[PDB]
């Protein structure tokens, strides 16, 4: 019902520019203030920016972000925007757009006052990576099940840049027993990841198993199937 | 890396 | 301007117990506090608003209370799906500063890992590199050690590890180790083995293969 979808993320040179979009649906978007919150790869949630709901202009920023990012919105298009300039290494993060429980203003005491109450619905988030390094698609190799009863088989996604890589199995039809591991950064400067699944040993001859790996900074979709 | 009981 | 703290930093509890975590604010923030949960790899979801009120559409599995500078969040009866990080956030400010988070894992019986070994694929030996992969599947507790041997010679500095987060159903951990060498010295040796030590093993488990 209430849906927030982020877009526009990707890789950008340090000091470059990028704009994030957030499509809203399932509520009166014009009637609520909205936030951008980010999450670094090894840190917690950090509030970035807010725009006020209703009639009239109000935007607020964090100290780490003020004067360099801009938060705008388009109520006819049901869209929220985060314009980013002068981007820095610390800005590399997953960016969620989020809905405030209220955030519209009131005319109180001859003044206009806004009441923000925090985020109540979030999107899945979009990844912004700032670096001067080259984007490299991953090479995908099988981890074949041994015929030597539970069996394990997997997918090795290697030498890609940057994060993130998504891996599913049998186009999402196979979820049980799957363990996709955190990616490791090699001395290479490129990432490597593993996706594993355990199956009944009988199934190795009967059931087909394919890993579906996506690297969207590369626009590489690969389907590799694992055979004994 | 909390060590359990 | 407002510093928010949480206690404890990380905890382990048993399934069925009720779990209490505390949040505290630098200055009085009245009852302007929210409680969020983030399961591993998912986005935050808001569980409690205005200190004590449960959010619409969320089950009656959490309670919360507090005021002024002291706030508490309680899971009524803990389940394996509730592993994750619990944040408090103040909204008495325009900074909306979050707390550092409280990591909630759950304690279960010891489980020894299932070890698998995977040789480098023929496709990757085209590239001139060889990646041997060792998998430690569904163990508990989280601590485990992997050691790579080549012709019974210990390796150092040419392998990397990765551990998944606690599983949402059976509360176990999994670990993947990747040993990378060049094809040239890979073909120089014969037997490749990964040796696993875990709290649930009387002796190290060695899984190995030969190039043929």
Residue numbers in the entry:
A (entry chain A): 1 to 52, 52A, 52B, 53 to 82, 82A, 82B, 82C, 83 to 100, ...
B (entry chain F): 12 to 16
C (entry chain B): 1 to 212
The publication says:
The HIV-1 Env glycoprotein is assembled as a trimer of heterodimers, with three gp120 membrane-distal subunits and three gp41 membrane-proximal and transmembrane subunits. Upon endoproteolytic cleavage of the gp160 precursor, the N-terminal region (fusion peptide, FP) of gp41 (Blumenthal et al., 2012) is liberated. The FP is hydrophobic, largely disordered (Guttman et al., 2014, Kumar et al., 2019), generally but not completely conserved in sequence (Kong et al., 2016), and essential for virus entry because of its critical involvement in membrane fusion (Blumenthal et al., 2012).
We determined a crystal structure of the ACS202 Fab in complex with the synthetic FP at 2.76-Å resolution. The ACS202 CDRs H2, H3, and L3 form a groove that accommodates the FP in an extended conformation. The electron density for the FP is well defined, and all residues except 521 are visible. The FP extends along the length of a hydrophobic groove in the ACS202 combining site and is stabilized by eight backbone-mediated hydrogen bonds, thereby forming an antiparallel β sheet with CDRH3. The A512 interaction is further stabilized by three main-chain hydrogen bonds to Y91 of CDRL3 and Y100K of CDRH3.
